[PDB]
Amino acid sequence: DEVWVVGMGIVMSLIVLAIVFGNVLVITAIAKFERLQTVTNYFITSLACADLVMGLAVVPFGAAHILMKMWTFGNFWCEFWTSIDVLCVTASIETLCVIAVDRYFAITSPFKYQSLLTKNKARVIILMVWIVSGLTSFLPIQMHWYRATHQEAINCYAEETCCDFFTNQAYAIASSIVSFYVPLVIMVFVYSRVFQEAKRQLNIFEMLRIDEGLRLKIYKDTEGYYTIGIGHLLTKSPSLNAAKSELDKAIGRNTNGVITKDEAEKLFNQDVDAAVRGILRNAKLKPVYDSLDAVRRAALINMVFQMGETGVAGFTNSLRMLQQKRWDEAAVNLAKSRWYNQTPNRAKRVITTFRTGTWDAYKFCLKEHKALKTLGIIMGTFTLCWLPFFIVNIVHVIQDNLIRKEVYILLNWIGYVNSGFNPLIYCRSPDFRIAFQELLCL
Ligand SMILES: CC(C)CCC[C@@H](C)[C@H]1CC[C@H]2[C@@H]3CC=C4C[C@@H](O)CC[C@]4(C)[C@H]3CC[C@]12C
Ligand SMILES: CC(C)CCC[C@@H](C)[C@H]1CC[C@H]2[C@@H]3CC=C4C[C@@H](O)CC[C@]4(C)[C@H]3CC[C@]12C
Ligand SMILES: CC(C)CCC[C@@H](C)[C@H]1CC[C@H]2[C@@H]3CC=C4C[C@@H](O)CC[C@]4(C)[C@H]3CC[C@]12C
Ligand SMILES: OC[C@H]1O[C@H](O[C@H]2[C@H](O)[C@@H](O)[C@H](O)O[C@@H]2CO)[C@H](O)[C@@H](O)[C@@H]1O
Ligand SMILES: CC(C)NC[C@H](O)COc1cccc2[nH]c3ccccc3c12
Ligand SMILES: *C(=O)CCCCCCCCCCCCCCC
């Protein structure tokens, strides 16, 4: 009973520690490593700063309030502490909203995956975000627009040991809509179209990129022959210069064995043309290919890339079942191949593609798409932590006191605790994980 408040104190103290530690680690990693200095990571800094202020200025005094069962920091700090609280929550959802919009234009840009913003313009945005949040949060609280007019609230306002957030319904509705719901709805809508667009960008180039790997330097394939890009054979000759000679010939310049990713895509597309042509000539492969849809045509091409035409024509039973759109039966047979035994992961995705006729097997495989997922998790996690609390806001406007006071406080703390989640989610990123490892004397 009094023992538990020490124990509750310990837990809340660990929460405060976790928020401050992780977010300082995030802020440090971005500031210290030049690799992590992207426009996206500038917003992550704004997001991490808001969470940090929560862990320092907001959460500790909220904890003391609950443990001590009263406000011991006076009326001025109460209004100020309340203003900071609201600001940080407003700033976070606005920043998240900016990231989603930024990511949208980056992915729909001809110059792909980089922002339409210079590093300075991005900073201006961040500053503007904090200012708008400040205007939205600090102004109404210090102007006393939020206050309710009934007596009980007036007692609490006047009382120096009472810090309760009593509000008039006009504020409760308008504030929670402008601060939270509006940037929420935008963020959810916009980023959902970010996902669609990323899913759109999956094609045979990405498929072979994932299944085979893209090499910018001249390398030797398993057979010892010189190759480059996505399994593009340059020459069977043992001389390197000839492979370079062949490469320069195909590319159209002096490469010295190194090409760009886009040049590799030219070569790959160049190869695909030959791969399709050979398939249409092959008597055993043409009927299957004619019958197949575009997606499954890519899966077959993927196999011809790996095995050659002769190898693929070996699956006589699987080919006939594919031709008859008996996908599952074709999958059972393809699983029993030498091909599945040697490279099971690649075979699994190709076979799965044959089953569904979709790209749902080459999904969040690209490093860039995994990054989009991490940002998705950040947004989702925030939504789920704060939405219940913010629903109750509106619920009590309709009909007040519908929900117990301890429940409302608890939901707020689920919202508070969110500030500690983001640094942990960033460990999904390989770059952040490596940045963290260096920073922790590991
Ligand atoms: C309102 C009081 C209590 C807290 C002040 C809010 C602070 C944390 C806000 C105010 C202006 C913000 C910044 C505005 C400009 C940028 C530049 C960018 O490269 C990193 C983030 C950064 C630096 C912002 C995050 C942190 C920031 C400094
Ligand atoms: C206002 C009280 C309650 C909290 C203290 C605010 C501190 C933690 C905030 C306010 C201004 C912030 C900074 C503003 C400028 C940037 C530059 C950026 O490249 C790294 C983070 C950094 C250095 C911020 C980190 C922390 C920071 C110093
Ligand atoms: C009031 C309470 C929350 C203050 C607690 C401050 C703690 C969280 C601060 C104070 C000193 C900080 C550390 C100082 C030493 C380093 C090494 C650096 O390369 C990365 C950050 C790191 C690991 C800091 C992490 C957190 C840290 C331990
Ligand atoms: O057989 C047609 C394609 O073969 C090469 O690419 C293969 C390579 O032979 C093989 O060692 C490896 O396992 O797979 C790659 C592709 O996944 C050619 O040089 C391509 O241009 C041909 O289309
Ligand atoms: C202990 C209390 C003070 N903490 C409130 C939440 O942490 C933050 O709640 C909000 C954040 C941003 C805008 C907001 N408008 C509101 C209207 C009513 C209640 C909370 C909020 C609110
Ligand atoms: C490598 O980066 C890991 C070793 C870093 C050790 C730094 C020691 C920090 C001591 C923290 C004590 C501060 C407590 C502050 C409480 C208010």
CB 304 within 8 A of CB 271: no
**Residue 90, Cβ density class (10 Å: 0-12 exposed, 13-18 middle, ≥19 buried):** buried
**What's the burial of 401, exposed, middle or buried (CB within 10 Å: 0-12/13-18/19+)?**
exposed
Q: Are 415 and 386 in contact (CB under 8 A)?
A: yes
Q: Which residue has the tokens 């309340």?
A: 82
Distance (Å, whole) CA 333 – CA 219: 33
Alpha-carbon 370 to chain mean position:
6
The binding site for (S)-carazolol consists of 85, 175, 412
> Beta partners for 215?
229
Distances (CA, A) of 251 to 35, 265, 324, 360: 30, 11, 41, 33
Please enumerate in sequence order all residues whose Cβ is within 8 A of that of 183, keeping only pairs 6 or more positions apart, or say none. 93, 94, 96, 97
Report the alpha-carbon distance of residue 197 to residue 193 in Å, rounded.
6
**CB 104 less than 6 A from any atom of ligand 3:** no
User: Alpha-carbon torsion 35, 40, 43, 44, what sign?
Assistant: negative
Ligand that comes closest to the CA of residue 21:
3
Phi, psi of 283 (to 5 degrees): -65, -30
Give me the amino acid identity at 224.
Answer: G
**Cβ of 52 below 6 Å from ligand 2:** yes
Structural contact between residues 245 and 238, judged by C-beta atoms closer than 8 angstroms: no
Q: 30: which residues sit within 8 A by CB, 6+ positions away?
A: 36, 37, 41, 42, 44, 45, 48
Cβ count near 66 (within 10 Å): 16
Ligand 6 centroid from CA 21, angstroms: 10
In sequence order, the 6+-apart residues with CB closer than 8 A to the CB of 70 are: 161, 162
Q: How far is residue 417's CA from residue 18's CA, in Å, rounded to a whole number?
A: 9
The label of the residue with tokens 């719901």 reads 181
Closest C-alpha among 391, 379, 426 to residue 98: 379
Domain boundaries, the chain: 1-202+363-442, 203-362
CA angle 168/65/165 to nearest 5° reads 5
CATH for 203-362 (1.20.1050.10, 3.40.50.1110, 3.40.50.300, 1.10.530.40): 1.10.530.40
Cα of 86 to ligand 5 centre, how many Å? 5
423: how many CB neighbours lie within 10 A of its CB?
23
* CATH architecture for residues 1-202+363-442: Up-down Bundle (1.20)
Q: What is the Cα–Cα distance from 369 to 388, expressed in whole angstroms?
A: 29
- Asked if 329 is an active-site residue, the reply is no
236, 306, 343: residue to mutate for ligand 4 pocket, most atoms within 8 A of CB: 306
CA atoms within 13 A on the CB side of 278: 14
Q: In what order do the strands lie in the sheet with 215-220?
A: 215-220, 226-229, 232-235
Tokens 């209004």 belong to residue: 79
Resolution at which this structure was determined, Å? 3.8
Cβ pair 260, 215 in contact under 8 A: no
Nearest to 206 by CA among 279, 258, 268: 268
Rg of the chain on CA atoms, in Å: 29
Which residue's entry shows tokens 């010295």?
256
Could you tell me the CA-to-CA distances from 359 to 53, 165, 306, 352 in Å, in that order? Answer: 42, 50, 19, 9
Determine the atom of ligand 5 nearest the C-alpha atom of 87. Answer: 12
Q: Closest by alpha carbon to 163, among 61, 59, 88, 11? A: 61
Contact 300, 290 (CB under 8 A): no
| Closest C-alpha to ligand 4, atom 11 | 221
Residues 6+ away with beta carbon under 8 Å from 238: none
CA distances from 442 to 325, 433, 437, 438 (A): 54, 11, 5, 6
Say if CB 126 and CB 99 are below 8 A apart: no
Question: Which residues, including other chains, have CB under 8 Å from residue 441's CB and lie 6 or more apart?
Answer: none
Ligand approaching nearest to the C-alpha of 436: 3
Torsion over CA: 231, 236, 240, 244 (sign): negative
Pocket lining for ligand 6, CB < 6 angstroms: 439-441
Measured CA to CA in angstroms, residue 257 lies from 71, 209, 244 at distances of 70, 19, 6
Pairing of strands 232-235, 215-220: unpaired
d(CA 42, CA 34): 12
C-alpha to C-alpha distance for 140 and 175, rounded to whole angstroms: 9
SS (H, E, C) the chain: CCHHHHHHHHHHHHHHHHHHHHHHHHHHHHHHCHHHCCHHHHHHHHHHHHHHHHHHHHHHHHHHHHHCCCCCCHHHHHHHHHHHHHHHHHHHHHHHHHHHHHHHHHHCCCCCCCCCCCHHHHHHHHHHHHHHHHHHHHHHHHCCCCCCCCHHHHHHHHCCCCCCCCCCHHHHHHHHHHHHHHHHHHHHHHHHHHHHHHHHCCCHHHHHHHHHCCEEEEEECCCCCEEEECCEEEECCCCHHHHHHHHHHHHCCCCCCECCHHHHHHHHHHHHHHHHHHHHHCCCCHHHHHHCCHHHHHHHHHHHHHHHHHHHHCCHHHHHHHHCCCHHHHHHHHHCCHHHHHCHHHHHHHHHHHHHCCCCCCCCCCHHHHHHHHHHHHHHHHHHHHHHHHHHHHHHHHCCCCCCHHHHHHHHHHHHHHHHHHHHHHHHCHHHHHHHHHHCCC
Calpha distance 308→126 (Å, rounded): 53
- d(C-alpha 425, C-alpha 421), whole Å: 6
State how far the alpha carbon of 339 is from the alpha carbons of 306, 313, 383, in Å: 9, 13, 45
Question: 28 C-alpha vs ligand 6 centroid, how far in Å?
Answer: 14
